[PDB]
Each structure stands twice: as C-alpha cells, then as structure tokens.
C-alpha cells in the first residue's frame, strides 16, 4: 500500500523479506508437479507430516546463483556450514518436487565453494613473499575476465525465455576452467 505497493510490484520481496508468495500459475501437472506429488502423498496417507518450504520463483534462483558464481559472497540462498555453501532445503519451486533441484543446486554449490575459498585467499593477502603476490595477481587476472562474462549475462537477463539448461550449458567453458 502506496509505498509497499510500489515495492511489491517493481522490487520482489517474497522469501527474503517476509511476504508469502502468491505467484499466479497455470497449474496442470507440467508446472504444478510439486503440488501434484504432495496431494498424491497425502492421498496415500503419509500420515500428515506437512512439509514447510517457502516457495521462491524460478528466475530468482538463477539470478542469485549467478551472483554466487561470479565471486561475491554472502547471498540469502544457500545455507553455509563453515563458509561452505550447500543447497537450501527450505525453499521450493512449483515443479520438480525439490529432488532434481537438490541435485543440480548441489552441483552449483560445489562450484561455489571452489570460488569462495579462492576469493577469500585473495582477500587475505591485502588484509613480502614476491611470489605469492604474483600468484594472487594471476588468479585475480583470471577472475576479473570470468566475472565480466557472468555480469553481462546477468544484465541480459532483464533484457526473454530463461531456464536452467541454457545458462548451465553456456557456462560450461567457465566451470570447466574453474576446476
């Protein structure tokens, strides 16, 4: 209302600021799959056990994962365990019933740890050796070019049909080099 209305419209605010997501849908199994399976589970008598996850949309995940992958840390998604990002099991998308998601988000979390530790290492040289200083400089010189390509993709998100398998495949020559 009047400022929260404008906020709710143009900015999102729905899992990471408390506002239960009423995102419209076309239901009918291909995008209703989590609900279809939950209703099936209840009809087979679990018994009861309501599963509570807070329902993020699809594209928001992909954008957040981009910002995770580029090299900046501390996002809302992905529970950290020591400084190791893992899959968040407190969110859910309208289909896939949180299992395929649990696999693929684990893959990107595996990449997120490798980039997290390297960027933390580079940060801890600025707070000599004459060889560590050149080493972090080479690592950094890679990272800036890598981060640039991620950032232009994230810019081009706002400017179409976005799903996982395009941005995953497009970043194959980057996650290969990351290993």
């Amino acid at each position: 209302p009047d400022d929260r209305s404008w906020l709710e419209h143009h900015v999102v605010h729905q899992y990471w600021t408390a506002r239960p997501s009423q995102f419209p849908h076309s239901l009918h199994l291909h995008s209703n799959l989590a609900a279809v399976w939950d209703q099936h589970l209840y009809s087979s008598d679990p018994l009861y056990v309501p599963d509570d996850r807070v329902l993020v949309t699809e594209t928001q995940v992909i954008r957040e994962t981009l910002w995770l992958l580029s090299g900046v840390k501390k996002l809302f998604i992905f529970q950290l365990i020591d400084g190791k990002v893992t899959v968040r099991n407190n969110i859910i998308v309208t289909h896939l019933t949180h299992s395929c998601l649990r696999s693929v988000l684990e893959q990107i979390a595996a990449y997120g740890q490798v980039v997290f530790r390297l960027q933390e290492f580079i940060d801890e040289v600025m707070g000599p050796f004459r060889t560590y200083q050149a080493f972090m400089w080479a690592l950094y010189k890679y990272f800036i070019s890598f981060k640039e390509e991620l950032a232009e993709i994230e810019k081009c998100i706002i400017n179409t049909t976005i799903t996982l398998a395009i941005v995953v495949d497009k970043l194959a020559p980057r996650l290969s080099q990351l290993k």
Binding site: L7, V11, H13, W16, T17, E64, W67, S70, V72, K73, K74, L75, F76, M126, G127, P128, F129, R130, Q133, A134, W137, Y140, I144, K147, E148, L150, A151, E152, E154, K155, I158
Partner: protein, 185 residues
Amino acid sequence: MIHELLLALSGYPGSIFTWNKRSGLQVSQDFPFLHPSETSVLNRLCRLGTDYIRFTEFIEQYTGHVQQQQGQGGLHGIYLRAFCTGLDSVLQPYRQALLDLEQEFLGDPHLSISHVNYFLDQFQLLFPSVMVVVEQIKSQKIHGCQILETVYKHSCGGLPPVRSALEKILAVCHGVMYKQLSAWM
C-alpha cells in the same frame, strides 16, 4: 542508488553512507528493503570512498595550509607537500572513471551493480596498497630524506599498477630535489 552511490564515492557522505572515523563509509543495513545480495557489492564499493576521503583529507590538511612553512617531515616540509601533490595526480583516473559511470547511468539507469563493481575492481587493489605507504611515513614521524627511500622500497612492489602509481609520486619528490640542487651546486 543512482546519484547516491556516485555522491558517496566522490567523497560526500550522505544519510545512506554515514561517515565515521572508526568505520568510514557504512550502509545503514537496518532496512528489509535492501537484501544480502546487493549488500555485499555495496560494502565492496564503500571501501574505495572511505580510503578516498582519507586521502583527500590528508592532502588538503597539509598542502596549501601554510605559505611555505621548527620542522618535522611527517608534519612539515616541502617533501611531504610534494608527496601529497603526487598522490593527488595519481588519483585523477579515479575521478575520470566515476565521471564515466555517471554517463552510463544516464544512458540506462537499470544497469547492474556488478558492472560497476567490475569497473571498480582495479582500484580495489590499488587503494589499500598506497594507504600503508602513507600511513607508515606519518606514523613513524619520518623526517627529511628518509621519506624518499620509504616510498622507493614500496616501488619495488609485486603489483605492477601499484608500482607504477607510486613511481609517479617518486618522480614528483625527485623533482623538488632537482629544483633545489640546480641552484645549490
């Protein structure tokens, strides 16, 4: 976000980026209207303006403050002033870069923060490196010609942009010595 960020980075603290002398620039970080995703990129940007305000404060405080000066090199003397001049001239690309950012904000105000962050990542290494070079000289009460050596050892650096950037300050402080010796000899 559009003008506010450039205003913070130029060295005018606002009510979003609140100046302290113990924490420099700082986000308010108590609103649920901004979120952990943008927060981190913003803190990374806050560092540069904090160091910038320190730099400009020192330069202004000790250059153009007396006619031309008894004596302590960490507070007085021509050499400290010529240092501050060299430090101001190396900061000129920072001004030029911020100016270009405003042009892109004018071209489209819905461009990502990570683009800005990517632009300013090269200063992200350079500013903390020169900060300790100035901080050691002022803290240790370094007098006279030892200042020229202290910067010279830090122009043996293992970062090439930092090395060339400090070399320019060394060129200025050499210039004043050239100017004096040219009459003395």
